[PDB]
Amino acid sequence: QLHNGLDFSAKVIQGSLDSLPQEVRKFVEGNAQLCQPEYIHICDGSEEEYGRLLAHMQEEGVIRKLKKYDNCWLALTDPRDVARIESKTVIITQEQRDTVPIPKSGQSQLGRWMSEEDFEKAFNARFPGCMKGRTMYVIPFSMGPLGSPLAKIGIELTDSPYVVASMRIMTRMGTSVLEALGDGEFIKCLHSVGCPLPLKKPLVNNWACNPELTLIAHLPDRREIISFGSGYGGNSLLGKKCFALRIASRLAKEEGWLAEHMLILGITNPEGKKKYLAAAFPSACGKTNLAMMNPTLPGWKVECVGDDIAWMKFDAQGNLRAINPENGFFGVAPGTSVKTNPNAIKTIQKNTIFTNVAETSDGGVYWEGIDEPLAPGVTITSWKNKEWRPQDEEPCAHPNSRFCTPASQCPIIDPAWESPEGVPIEGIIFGGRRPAGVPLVYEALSWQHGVFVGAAMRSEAVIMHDPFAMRPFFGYNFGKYLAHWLSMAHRPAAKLPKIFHVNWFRKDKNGKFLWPGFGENSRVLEWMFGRIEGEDSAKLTPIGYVPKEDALNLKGLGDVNVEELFGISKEFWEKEVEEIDKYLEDQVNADLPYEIERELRALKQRISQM
Numbered sequence: 001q002l003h004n005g006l007d008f009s010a011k012v013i014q015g016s017l018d019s020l021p022q023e024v025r026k027f028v029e030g031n032a033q034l035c036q037p038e039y040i041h042i043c044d045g046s047e048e049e050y051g052r053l054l055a056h057m058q059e060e061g062v063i064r065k066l067k068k069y070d071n072c073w074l075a076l077t078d079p080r081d082v083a084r085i086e087s088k089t090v091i092i093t094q095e096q097r098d099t100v101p102i103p104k105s106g107q108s109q110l111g112r113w114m115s116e117e118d119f120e121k122a123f124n125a126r127f128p129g130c131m132k133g134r135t136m137y138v139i140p141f142s143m144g145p146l147g148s149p150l151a152k153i154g155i156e157l158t159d160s161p162y163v164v165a166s167m168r169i170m171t172r173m174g175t176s177v178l179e180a181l182g183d184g185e186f187i188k189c190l191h192s193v194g195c196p197l198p199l200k201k202p203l204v205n206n207w208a209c210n211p212e213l214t215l216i217a218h219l220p221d222r223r224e225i226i227s228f229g230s231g232y233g234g235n236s237l238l239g240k241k242c243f244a245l246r247i248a249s250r251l252a253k254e255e256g257w258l259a260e261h262m263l264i265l266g267i268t269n270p271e272g273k274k275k276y277l278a279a280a281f282p283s284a285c286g287k288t289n290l291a292m293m294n295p296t297l298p299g300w301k302v303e304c305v306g307d308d309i310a311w312m313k314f315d316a317q318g319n320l321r322a323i324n325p326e327n328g329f330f331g332v333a334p335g336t337s338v339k340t341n342p343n344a345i346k347t348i349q350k351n352t353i354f355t356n357v358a359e360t361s362d363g364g365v366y367w368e369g370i371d372e373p374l375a376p377g378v379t380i381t382s383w384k385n386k387e388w389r390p391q392d393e394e395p396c397a398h399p400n401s402r403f404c405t406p407a408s409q410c411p412i413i414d415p416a417w418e419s420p421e422g423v424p425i426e427g428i429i430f431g432g433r434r435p436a437g438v439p440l441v442y443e444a445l446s447w448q449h450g451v452f453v454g455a456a457m458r459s460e461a462v463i464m465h466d467p468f469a470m471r472p473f474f475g476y477n478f479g480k481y482l483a484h485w486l487s488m489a490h491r492p493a494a495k496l497p498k499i500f501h502v503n504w505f506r507k508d509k510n511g512k513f514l515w516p517g518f519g520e521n522s523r524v525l526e527w528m529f530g531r532i533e534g535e536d537s538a539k540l541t542p543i544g545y546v547p548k549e550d551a552l553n554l555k556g557l558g559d560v561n562v563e564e565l566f567g568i569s570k571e572f573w574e575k576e577v578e579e580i581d582k583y584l585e586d587q588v589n590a591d592l593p594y595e596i597e598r599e600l601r602a603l604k605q606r607i608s609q610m
Ligand SMILES: O=C([O-])C(=O)[O-]
Pocket: 234, 283, 308, 330
């Protein structure tokens, strides 16, 4: 430099620009030049850093300590900033069609593209000087076990201490990640709450955000994630959805692997034989519930590898190896009870950050569906910081409120949850909320049919399409994604996992659920287990294999309505197939793999013959 305006060394309050890898320093310094932070804090990932940052946020009123628990915290946000906003979530590529198929109707439900040109304008409208008066935190994080050949590293720059704290839980972060990275490639993650000081607008609930300018951008060819205006969850914790789904799915396409919205669980039978299963459900269908299920069948054990995302790659032996890229659970809080999820309740008792849940007068947490009586006299403060009663119109916790907890604390965390080589997947489970027509469980007829079943997934929010549970998350053209899945069948040695589809939520003719669910879902898993083992416990139907008469263990369940629960009606499925046909033609069109259209034609024909 000729002057003093490019070297940010004097601004570093922890760490050293001289200690960073070359490309890390350039990423850090270049963005400091643009965003103009008062300070640069290079995170070390220490407990000391963590505790002090927590106490600082506490003193500022950004978070509250929950006194009932061990080292637990509560953040209440500005009500404008409570969730991911897909309309403000975009992927930038040279051509639109690389990001999304071109829909015949004109409006895509499979993603949202922005031109390079439009993003540049948006970027320039947002980031210059955006961190004035704030600390820029530098988060070196690994997605996956540090030593895993399947793990990927990112650097996230942020002006939110809430993000730092949450990222510590959700990823492996700190000095060891920088040491592991060296001069290797990393995903560039830039985040700002978009409120430079002095504040131009009112600070609501001590929660910095810029709703009008909120934009969550992905530049896969630049390996960059750029997010502005939201401090919340999947908008700000850049490793989770942005990196481990959107960027990663593109990388996976390029490199021969898969990045998927799937839980990973290990299940052991009463004979000591263990299998790993993956399952993709929409974000309201019992995913965390299944991942840390407490099975009701004697002698069965379920252990949790991950509850949200899976990175999967065939090894030289042909086994589909999976890792959980995350280091914690960012779970939806309402609906979590000792009934629905006893192991979740146990996990979140300590070292856990809660966001937008209710607080009890004795320093505890509360939300809809917690199904836990309070002592008389104990009162509730809602997520809106106001007195609340169980009979009031509005809920005490926001529907998208969250716990943010360490994975290592789950009482049934799998002993291989951090194994570098990953765990061998033997089955993949798709599923949704369908009150009618769709059986409790069926098995895909082939890999190609299995990919179709994934592609055809629909779930009651109105029943909407959500293929592979990836609708908000495709890093690239969904048709190409289908092609990618299909190509797995053409590599020699590959042991293709059996594919199943589940529906826990089928109802009778008056609104009553047909299946008790929760821990009883172990009875369905047992069937899958046996089918993987090659047992003839199946009956052929037009939609795939279903359990034979008496194949399902229904002991202790009373009078289960088997005929309704597993009923398949021509009328319903004629409608179903036409709807899938119209959806795929519109939304995928020219990019629809031949094999998928073939499976569609085949299903239609099987239905026509019943
Ligand atoms: O936060 C999540 O996990 C989601 O929205 O799928």
